[PDB]
Symmetry: C3
Subunit: 391 residues, 3 copies
């Protein structure tokens, strides 16, 4: 005997069957997902951070003018200044009633703070997704691992179980992301040797200790000002600093489908998409599913704040009355609005907060809490102004 | 009793079972998908449109030459012109070198037409996908909603149904799109402050009413021409206009898997990918599937026009003979060619048009109509020439 | 009667049921996947290759001032100077009062080698995914095709089979790729008219025979050097050549989920993600699944070489003892490490090599071979240094 089924891939909402095998005491099978880990394969492309300008001591020369070649230094520059000979100071500096020459030069290197303050630009692709399912068969509790890259057969309670491959493997991570501290961003970060001044990627290197530093800060050598010889130049404030102010909110709180982002190993958790098929040694006869959901009534939607076209810029709040504290499912029956989370716990208190998203100022959607529906009407404000860069 | 099954996620091709429950009159269950809505979470990055050059009145000055600083204006420019055009007040008074300094300046602001003619660049990620399934149980017809972010249990006809989560959620939308009018494009549009002259994103601002206008039109101040003082300058014709001519065909007609694009709320409809699992209170004994497909013969392929390496640039036409008007499935058994639609209605007329795609000039694939096969042979022309920009 | 099931979408690991239909001889059904083809819809954006500089005949002036306009050639460059004073005159030709003049110019065109040595930048999106399943029903063997864009009903062995739509359609290809020879890369290649000097896309054209050549090699006209008139200029070595050295490893060996890349028609093979649901005319009573996996013990992990944050930069080697040569499944129970392949053949020899990936130097994960586990401890080196471009 082999009975096949399929449970939802959502952490929380359980599967409860009432296995009444003709023999004696009836078993109450119940398996539900408790975790979901989707780790991508980060392929570090490069890292960027505050840069540090570097100009060595200048070469005071006479009319015996020199000419600077070209070395291998990040954004390295050099210019021989003719008749910029600062002129005068004490003794005799170039009596030639014509002109001397100034050999000014300067390059770039990543600030001494990169080590403990830099962002990373990885190129990630979903590597594997596995889930932990806790099955409570009668008087036995066991946790099984389920993947996408293959099924998994296990024997629990003297019964054989086979948790077929997860239907799909959805990822909230794009193919190009940027990890800063504990934050993760989905940015189409400029390629390696393609950074632009005053913008993310101002300077670039494979790693902090790397030795392939690339920069493009628009370092421009200016002509010396009479008085005390020094090296004047124009640049463009650390793009990295600029990015810090620009870069919006992280994925950490804009992840769809209730997906939760984490940073150390970098992964998406409890992402709610798909189903997990199972099968056992029992006739579809002994099997009988149980569906006991918290009955709720007097639903009421209330939108506090809401922002126009921005990943979940709205905030809905549902008031209600329940008969039993539980865990319900939330949905939107209007394509004009989308819900971030895909579930919410229903407490007898009567308060549920959800984040929604829409691109229509003044939208009118209908949210749902289990089997109850309610309308939501709100007026949203357009997205914040950007942070204009060096104009 | 719990019997599990799974129907295709294609709008049209139905599921028909013959439930012969031992009691009496036999039931004829039949459930099929009728719609599919996959809405993404657009996160407006910025919008662009035709720009408008703005040059204020010029500052006529004497040899008492002035020097222009630098204000905060889009692509703002200014240049002090030393020694321009012989004309004067009094009797050529200035004197002190130069003869005449000119303070010319000009910046940019989005054209007065952006409001009702601008494109939008959103950053979208699949937010939710739901489908409408019409189940016709015996003498009862009911429509149920099915999602990916969770299952859904419903009671219909005194029988309990549970439409498990949709297998997967495929999206024809990339992570960076551009919405113009009723069209949608998959473009890796340049980032915010990174627009280039004569190219899409010439100017950029979060919103039309925004106040973070960014531009890079390559505005260059030219020296005045003797005669009537005015402000000469070089620019680069509105990249936006250029884009209009460049931007190929929209996704609206290049969407794979028969997916249909829509614009108001922005979503993909009837996308044909996946399956929808269901389960009821009935033994696999009373269940018996029915598969009555239109039998067709004398299949014949004929390729009219075909373009090389371009999203579905070919057009196949199948002639045939059917026994009953119905709805068949179309497929390609040769990796060298791919079919856009995944189904086609079979009329007794004998005419079926399909769009195919291949990257091989002179390909030889085999299309299929239900259970009938036929060969297609055609010779394709390479893709159209691009529209070279300001050379 | 209709019994539903679901087999894994992995080439190799089979499905084996023991159909004991009360009638006579017990049947041994066994169906397994043998291939998987996911072809995308490449939409050729443009191609690039080594460029070739072109310099017309130098306008050897003398007593005039021929001025240059703006030709329509690729990145036209024209400058006119007033030197070349070695002598070269004679008087009988140029008895002028004014000094010499000279108008030099150049433009670009793709090297004569593009035809048989160029890369291509396509814009690809999954078009269709089909799989070949070999079902061995009793004393009959038949191969059926299964897709995502619809189900497929077939009759084999006098029994009716319906292979529902594949759960999902995972693709290892991004939305922007680059095909070179037999290699495929996932690169966010610069758009059409947006190429940069000394970088991939130096020059760009829709096709090799195209007539929309675009270039940006930073061609700079230099002033002639006294002696023999010629045309001096500065450029930037073929970005294409640079790319050749830069462009890392191809997708061909970094494809996740054991996916295998191919080049002629361009597709991903045996990609192991998902499940394939089936159904027949038999009670869940006659059905009984069989799961006979090779029992292995004395597992031992040994990491040879390992590279930090780079798509599968590590290499694990498992030693062991088996009871029967077979085919096992490999997994990682630690989010800190991911396995490339999703299966491995188990020979009595006792040697299995796997590629893993992690972003943590000095990681400690636990690999698995069927039902056996083992720990892996290794220390990895950071990713190679990039290849700094023209500094
Ligand atoms: C297989 O798994 C089954 C289900 O999963 C749970 O397994 C356990 C082992 C954990 O790993 C959980 O994380 C899993 O969810 C097992 O069944 C569960 O067993 C556990 C262990 O006893 C039960 O834990 C208890 O949880 C409740 C939670 O509160 C809510 O309970 C329900 C909702 O489910 C409602 O009534 C209501 O909404 C409640 O709010 C909690 O009350 C308990 O916690 C308190 O007591 C424990 C010890 O008794 C203590 O550790 C905590 O600090 C809590 O506070 C006080 O502690 C002191 C001493 O520490 C006590 O003296 C005092 O009484 C406590 N005061 C309070 C706050 O009342 C407790 O942790 C859980 O309820 C079961 N889940 C189910 C099915 O409902 C199953 O046992 C296992 N297999 C088997 C059968 O072996
Ligand atoms: C359960 O669902 C069944 C099927 O639902 C389908 O609905 C369509 C619209 C799609 O969504 C499909 O994918 C669904 O599967 C229901 O059965 C359907 O019943 C209707 C009516 O019996 C059928 O629809 C008709 O089909 C005929 C062809 O036989 C058309 O001529 C007809 O066109 C018109 O319909 C409008 C209604 O908007 C009428 O006002 C109009 O006059 C015209 O009707 C025809 O009028 C002329 C007089 O001028 C008369 O001579 C014709 O007899 C009359 N036609 C009929 C029969 O209506 C319309 O499209 C549909 O074909 C049936 N589906 C099938 C093929 O099984 C069933 O009723 C549902 N159960 C319940 C009660 O909820
Ligand atoms: C179904 O496939 C099997 C392979 O699994 C075929 O069996 C092979 O039979 C030949 C000759 O009898 C042997 O040399 C192989 O070793 C067999 N393979 C195995 C492991 O069974 C079988 O013939 C096929 N069924 C048909 C078409 O009759
Ligand atoms: Br990149
Ligand atoms: Br961007
Ligand atoms: Br592009
Ligand atoms: Ho600025
Ligand atoms: Ho041009
Ligand atoms: Ho990009
Ligand atoms: Ho260089």
């Amino acid at each position: 005997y082999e009975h096949s089924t399929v449970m939802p891939n959502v952490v929380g909402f359980p599967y409860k069957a009432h296995i009444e095998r003709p023999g004696y005491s009836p078993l109450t099978l119940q398996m539900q997902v408790v975790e979901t880990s989707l780790e991508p394969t980060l392929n570090l492309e490069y890292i960027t951070c505050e840069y540090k300008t570097v100009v060595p001591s200048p070469y005071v020369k006479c009319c015996g003018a020199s000419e600077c070649s070209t070395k291998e230094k990040p954004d390295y520059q050099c210019k021989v200044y003719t008749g910029v000979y600062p002129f005068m100071w004490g003794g005799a500096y170039c009596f030639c009633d014509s002109e001397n020459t100034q050999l000014s030069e300067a390059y770039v290197d990543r600030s001494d703070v990169c080590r403990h303050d830099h962002a990373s630009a990885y190129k990630a692709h979903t590597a594997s997704l596995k889930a932990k399912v806790r099955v409570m068969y009668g008087n036995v509790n066991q946790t099984v691992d389920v993947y996408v890259n293959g099924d998994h057969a296990v024997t629990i309670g003297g019964t054989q179980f086979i948790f077929g491959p997860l239907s799909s493997a959805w990822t909230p991570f794009d193919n190009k992301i940027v990890v800063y501290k504990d934050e993760v961003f989905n940015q189409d970060f400029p390629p390696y040797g393609s950074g632009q001044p005053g913008r993310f990627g101002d300077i670039q290197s494979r790693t902090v200790e790397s030795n392939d530093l690339y920069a493009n800060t628009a370092l421009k050598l200016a002509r010396p000002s009479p008085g005390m010889v020094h090296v004047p130049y124009t640049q463009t404030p650390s793009g990295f600093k600029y990015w810090l102010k620009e870069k919006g909110t992280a994925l950490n709180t804009k992840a769809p489908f209730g997906c939760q982002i984490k940073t150390n190993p970098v992964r998406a958790m409890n992402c709610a998409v798909g189903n997990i098929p199972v099968s056992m040694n029992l006739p579809d006869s002994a099997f009988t599913r149980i569906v006991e959901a918290p009955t709720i009534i007097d639903l009421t939607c209330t939108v506090a704040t809401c922002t126009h076209s921005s990943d979940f810029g709205g905030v809905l709040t549902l008031t209600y009355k329940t008969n039993k504290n539980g865990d319900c499912s939330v949905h939107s029956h209007s394509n004009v609005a989308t819900l971030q989370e895909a579930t919410a716990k229903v407490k007898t208190a009567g308060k549920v907060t959800l984040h929604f998203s829409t691109a229509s100022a003044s939208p009118s959607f209908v949210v749902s809490l289990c089997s109850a529906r309610a309308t939501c009407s709100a007026s949203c404000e357009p997205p914040k102004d950007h942070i204009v860069p060096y104009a």
